[PDB]
Design a protein around this nucleic acid. Structure first.
Lengths: 335, 887
DNA sequence: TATCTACCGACAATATCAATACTTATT
DNA sequence: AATAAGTATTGATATAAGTAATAGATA
């Protein structure tokens, strides 16, 4: 029974680097009822949780008191936040570690070298039921971290080498709107195509009622996200935050060529395919016109393309005898 | 034939003068051919190649690219003249109405009048050439940036039109197109070139592995994300890259500015001089309008006559390619292995095996970085090899004849040769290739100077002249081996600091050694004489420093003293004490520190895991030259004050914010020779102008721009020192040219014959005196006080007050009648201009009295430059005897 | 006093999209 | 004489994805 920190304690913490942490226990009860984690984690008494950016550490205490896992590793580096977490959760079955979530080495050292946190590798058909990852990447500047972690799902090399590890990610509402955009919407970019190809992702809770107007109406009906006020986020200044449950899925395309094609097509996400295929290589439009026998697809802008059409285009790209080199796509600045 | 051999053959000087006189006449026609415009030369050459090849047959030989270019031109010309016709079909409509909202409304009506100004074939040749020149630039791997390309093509068309206009005006006896029109015109032309340029390419399909061929566009317009911000690029097909990075590139893209074969036209005004037919300006930099405006005014006054004298002596020196060195470099080039600086021919880049995709992100990131490094090195070597081949082609063409390099000035005033590709101011190989056309008997002094020259080249210039001569004598057998067998032997010359020049001098010395009487031998080899860090010598002279002057050899000494070594010793002691203190940064890096690192940091300072080195080197140099540090502080402070000053007349209600005036004043000063210098550090404001291919993020140079105060302050000291260096060089060049010396200056070094060095040395010292007998910091402060007289500065209220005449100056309250006091009227008028709290008139005048009795407010001080630092006593005229002043 | 926090300049370019000013088309 | 409409133009934001770089006074 880890003692949960309240609003009294977490008000003395002056620095947060820009991160916002929900502190209301009732909203956490609603969220953990909505997730019903005991449906995918049948034996919670053996689950291993890796908490990145725990911050105030209320979600962690509530998770432990509700499910009582086997090992709960809190990777908190921030000085004042580490001080609070280690002064409040001393002697408790939580594991507070002072290691930077951002650094890649942190995982390699912890999982492999120090062996403090050792997950269980599982197959790639079901969600890993012995390893669950939780993260609060809420800082307005720490958006590249989410994208890198999504790329890791495609590469199966960071933590997704232990199977299909489910992630519970707090993130700005603008980030969740970028990711959860559906074909043709306004916020549809390559991050959303990456999410669509690699993940099955639901919006579990949002911190503003006037933010849900940026998501898909049908998707908002299916998800039914919990709504709570900004009076329960502690740092009461910044933008709204959004909780996102993210389960990896299977994919059978070439991630390198798909990355190239998707990144170069979503530049001109409003130009029809009649004229946007020359940005891929020399003679790209002639080739993709002689090849695409669906003369209707040739009219859809890359913002209207689903992921399956993107995989189709990368399949055509990899059959192109004169395709460019996807390695020499950088800008040589030493020049 | 080899004209140089015939010239050397002639026994008597009168006969040589007669032959040279004949040579000028015979070379006039060839010079006219050399100055042929790019459009005419390129079109004639590739068309001729295509016509000849058609008869010979089709093959992928040296002229294959020329044939492709002529085909592209022929099938692109109809497109552009059809565009012109379609522009005229609506340009005579005279009715601007609700028309096609994109293709004719604003775009075609805008550039319509600009396509007609020049014939279409010229535009086709210009776009083809200007895209070929931009291969592998701007960071793109095998292409260019689209903004640079569209602007280069539009600007080349503008320059061709204005050249045509100048020629028409001389024969019969917008103005400057905006950036938007340049961009739009260039994009329109390159679009057509993109859509007619085809190249045949091979490839092996993955589904069937059948070797298949097909046509593909030679250029493509795409984008690339760099650091998360897309830029549009134009990629060139690899089939074309093989021929752009090829030995025959010079045939396709010839160099318009080559060394002339006839004496350059003397500079008589800023716009006339140099090339006989090509017309060139007196300033290399055309980006800044203000610099050209001041240069034009100064030229009109005629006060830069001394600058012309120096430039004309610098330009009238005849050179000739060093055939002996040329053969060795040509042999090494043909061999293909990597030599001292030559990279060595490489077919394709070899990348290390890719790591498994499942490897953790750090491993992948490292691999990506390594791939970037390998690609950068490969592109670097290809660029270097191409530049070398181009330079050797120019050298081979001019091997027999005598060539002259006309010179130009930069904003600071440094002189640069007009011909960029091949000149004596380039790399070590380029310097080695060139030698003086005129041969002067060595004499007693010359032999010693040639030996000391070789010693200097090998890097032993610290030692006294006797030691340097001793070194050459001791290595006489090595010199013989290097000259007799340049490559098959031990290659001792390769170990030299400047190997190509060392080889050239080795050849010269070897010839001398075979002569019973060395003095009779006539040497064409130029000998380089330079002072150790010219800037420090100037700082010492301006300051009057005594401790500093000794280090720079201002005061005569038996043993030459080098600043670099003394500062290195001091900073070494400083690091030693730092290490004793307890920091490990000094200890780990003590061994690594060498003379070169100090030479580079000191050179940058005076001319522009460890951070201890930069601070310590600056601290040591500051202590060594305290007066110089004081002058640098004064220059920086003056630049900052000028940057914050606001001109009274230019201030009006035009400002976007009434209380936030823009700062448009840039430091401007006059060189002792009279050349005006205008620091061009403005704040660019870029915008997306719409073109056919894309919207390019370009900046307008005509747009007046607030001055970049930070760069102004960081640039006064180095630019002032560069101006003094250029002044000393132009004075000594004028004097040497008057005395009859062939003077060549490579900014740091002054070159002449070995038999003239002594002579030149005298001149050098003398001109230094003639430059520093007058207090230059004081003259600069007086010029600043005159030019920045009626300016006003914005000031905060966090520091103390300096004087007691501001409180009445800002008000302009006192009656000013019966005298022209419209300045009082003008200063008050500016306050009217400044937008104080007013609907009425006297509300900011009576407020400052509470500030005059202060209260925090952005006050209007008068611009007052500080007083010059105390000048340490040092008679510069003791320099007439320092035999190591320049050495 | 000895690590904690702050200085975003290379978002050193460009596509797209919402908001702000400059012509109008009937009664 | 209305009253909505349009467009021409400008300013904002997102883009990719190891986060370059320094200190700064303070906990």
């Amino acid at each position: 029974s880890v003692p949960i920190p309240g609003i009294k304690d977490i008000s003395k913490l002056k620095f947060f680097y820009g991160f916002k942490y929900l502190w209301n226990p009732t909203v956490y009860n609603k969220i953990f009822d909505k997730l019903d984690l005991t449906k995918t984690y049948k034996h919670p008494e053996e689950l291993k949780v890796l908490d990145l950016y725990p911050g105030v550490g209320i979600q962690s205490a509530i998770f432990y008191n509700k499910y009582c896992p086997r090992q709960y590793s809190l990777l908190e580096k921030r000085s004042s936040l580490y001080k609070f977490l280690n002064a409040k959760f001393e002697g408790s079955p939580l594991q507070i570690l002072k290691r930077d979530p951002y650094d890649w080495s942190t995982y390699s050292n912890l999982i492999d070298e120090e062996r403090i946190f050792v997950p269980e590798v599982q197959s790639s058909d079901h969600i890993n039921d012995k390893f669950l990852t939780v993260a609060n990447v809420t800082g307005e500047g720490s958006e590249g971290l989410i994208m890198q972690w999504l790329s890791c799902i495609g590469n199966k090399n960071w933590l997704y080498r232990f199977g299909k590890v489910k992630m519970l990610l707090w993130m700005p509402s603008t980030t969740a709107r970028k990711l959860l955009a559906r074909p043709g919407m306004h916020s549809r970019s390559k991050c959303s195509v990456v999410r669509e190809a690699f993940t099955d992702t639901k919006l579990i809770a949002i911190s503003d009622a006037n933010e849900l107007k940026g998501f898909d109406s049908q998707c908002i009906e299916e998800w039914d996200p919990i709504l709570f006020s900004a009076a329960e986020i502690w740092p009461t200044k910044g933008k709204p935050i959004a909780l996102v449950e993210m389960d990896p899925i299977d994919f059978d395309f070439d991630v390198d060529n798909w990355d190239y094609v998707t990144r170069h097509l979503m530049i001109l996400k409003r130009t029809p395919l009649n004229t946007v295929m020359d940005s891929l290589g020399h003679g790209g439009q002639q080739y993709f016109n002689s090849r695409i026998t669906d003369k209707d697809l040739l009219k859809k802008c890359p913002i209207d393309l689903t992921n399956d059409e993107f995989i189709y285009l990368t399949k055509l790209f990899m059959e192109w005898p004169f395709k460019p080199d996807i390695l020499m796509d950088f800008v040589d600045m030493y020049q | 034939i080899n004209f140089f051999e015939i010239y050397n053959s002639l026994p008597t000087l009168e006969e040589k003068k007669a032959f040279e006189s004949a040579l000028n006449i015979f070379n006039q026609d060839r010079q006219k051919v050399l100055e042929n415009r790019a459009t005419e030369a390129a079109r004639e050459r590739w068309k001729h190649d295509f016509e000849e090849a058609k008869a010979r047959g089709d093959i992928s030989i040296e002229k294959n690219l020329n044939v492709k270019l002529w085909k592209w031109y022929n099938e692109m010309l109809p497109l552009v003249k059809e565009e012109i016709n379609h522009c005229r079909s609506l340009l005579s409509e005279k009715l601007s109405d609700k028309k096609g909202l994109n293709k004719v409304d604003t775009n075609r009506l805008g550039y319509g009048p600009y396509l007609t100004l020049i014939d279409p074939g010229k535009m086709c040749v210009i776009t083809i050439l200007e895209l070929l020149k931009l291969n592998s630039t701007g960071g793109v791997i095998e292409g260019m940036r689209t903004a640079r390309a569209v602007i280069s093509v539009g600007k080349a068309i503008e320059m061709e039109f204005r050249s045509e206009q100048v020629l028409k005006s001389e024969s019969q006896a917008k103005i400057l197109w905006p950036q938007s029109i340049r961009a739009r015109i260039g994009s329109v032309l390159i679009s057509m070139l993109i859509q007619v340029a085809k190249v045949s390419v091979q490839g092996v399909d993955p589904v069937t592995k059948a070797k298949v061929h097909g046509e593909a566009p030679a250029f493509a317009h795409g984008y690339q994300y760099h650091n998360g911000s897309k830029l549009g690029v134009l990629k060139i097909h690899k089939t074309l890259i093989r021929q752009l990075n090829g030995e025959r590139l010079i045939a396709s893209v010839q160099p318009q500015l080559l060394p002339m074969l006839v004496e350059p036209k003397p500079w008589v005004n800023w716009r006339s001089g140099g090339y006989h037919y090509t017309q060139s300006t007196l300033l290399r930099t055309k980006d800044s309008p203000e610099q050209v405006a001041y240069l034009k005014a100064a030229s009109d006054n005629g006060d830069i006559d001394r600058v012309y004298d120096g430039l004309n002596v610098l330009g009238r020196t005849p050179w000739t390619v060093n055939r002996k060195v040329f053969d060795v470099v040509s042999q090494v080039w043909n061999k293909g292995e990597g030599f001292l600086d030559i990279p060595g021919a490489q077919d394709e880049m070899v990348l290390p095996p890719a790591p498994p995709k499942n490897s953790d992100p750090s491993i992948l990131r490292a691999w990506k970085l390594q791939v970037k490094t390998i690609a950068n090195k490969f592109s670097s070597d290809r660029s270097n090899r191409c530049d070398t081949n181009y330079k050797l082609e120019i050298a081979r063409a001019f091997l027999g004849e005598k060539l002259y390099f006309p010179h130009n000035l930069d904003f600071r005033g440094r002189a640069y040769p007009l011909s960029p590709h091949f000149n004596h101011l380039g790399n070590d190989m380029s310097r080695g290739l060139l030698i003086f056309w005129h041969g002067k008997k060595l004499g007693p002094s010359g032999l010693k100077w040639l030996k000391i020259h070789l010693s200097n080249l090998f890097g032993f210039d610290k030692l006294p002249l006797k030691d340097r001569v001793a070194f050459t004598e001791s290595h006489l057998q090595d010199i013989k081996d290097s000259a007799e067998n340049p490559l098959t032997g031990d290659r001792w010359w390769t170990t030299a600091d400047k190997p190509w020049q060392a080889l050239a001098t080795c050849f010269e010395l070897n010839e001398v050694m075979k002569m019973d009487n060395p003095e009779e031998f006539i040497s064409h080899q130029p000998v380089h004489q330079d002072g150790t860090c010219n800037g420090l010598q100037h700082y010492a002279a301006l300051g009057g420093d005594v401790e500093g002057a000794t280090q720079v050899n201002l005061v005569p000494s038996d043993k030459p003293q080098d600043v670099y070594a003394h500062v290195a010793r001091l900073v070494q002691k400083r690091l030693e004490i730092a290490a004793e203190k307890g920091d490990e940064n000094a200890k780990i890096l003590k061994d690594k520190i060498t003379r070169k690192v100090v030479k580079q940091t000191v050179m940058t300072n005076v001319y522009g895991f460890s951070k201890y080195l930069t601070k310590h080197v600056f601290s040591a140099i500051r202590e060594l030259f305290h007066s110089a540090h004081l002058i640098q502080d004064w220059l920086g402070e003056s630049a900052k004050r000028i940057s914050k000053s606001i001109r009274l007349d230019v201030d009006e209600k035009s400002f976007k914010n009434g209380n936030k005036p823009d700062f448009m004043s840039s430091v401007i000063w006059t060189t002792p020779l009279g050349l005006p210098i205008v620091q061009p550090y403005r704040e660019e404001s870029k915008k997306q102008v719409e073109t056919n291919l894309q919207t390019v993020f370009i900046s307008d140079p005509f747009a007046v721009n607030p001055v970049n105060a930070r760069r102004q302050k960081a640039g006064l000291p180095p630019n002032f020192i560069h101006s003094l260096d250029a002044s000393h060089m132009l004075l000594s060049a004028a004097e040497c040219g008057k005395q009859g010396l062939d003077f060549a200056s490579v900014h740091d070094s002054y070159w002449t014959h070995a038999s003239d060095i002594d002579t030149m040395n005298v001149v050098l010292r003398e001109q230094f005196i003639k430059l520093h007998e007058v207090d230059l910091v004081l003259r600069l402060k007086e010029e600043f006080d005159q030019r920045y007289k009626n300016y006003v500065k914005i000031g905060k209220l966090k520091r103390s007050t300096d004087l007691a005449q501001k409180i009445i100056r800002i008000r302009k309250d006192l009656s000013r009648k019966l005298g022209r006091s419209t300045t009082l009227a003008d200063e008050i008028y500016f306050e009217k201009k400044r937008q104080e709290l007013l609907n009425e008139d006297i509300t900011d005048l009576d407020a400052l009295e509470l500030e005059n009795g202060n209260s925090g407010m952005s006050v209007l001080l008068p611009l007052r430059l500080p007083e010059i630092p105390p000048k340490g006593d040092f008679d510069v005229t003791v320099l007439r005897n320092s035999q190591y002043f320049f050495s």
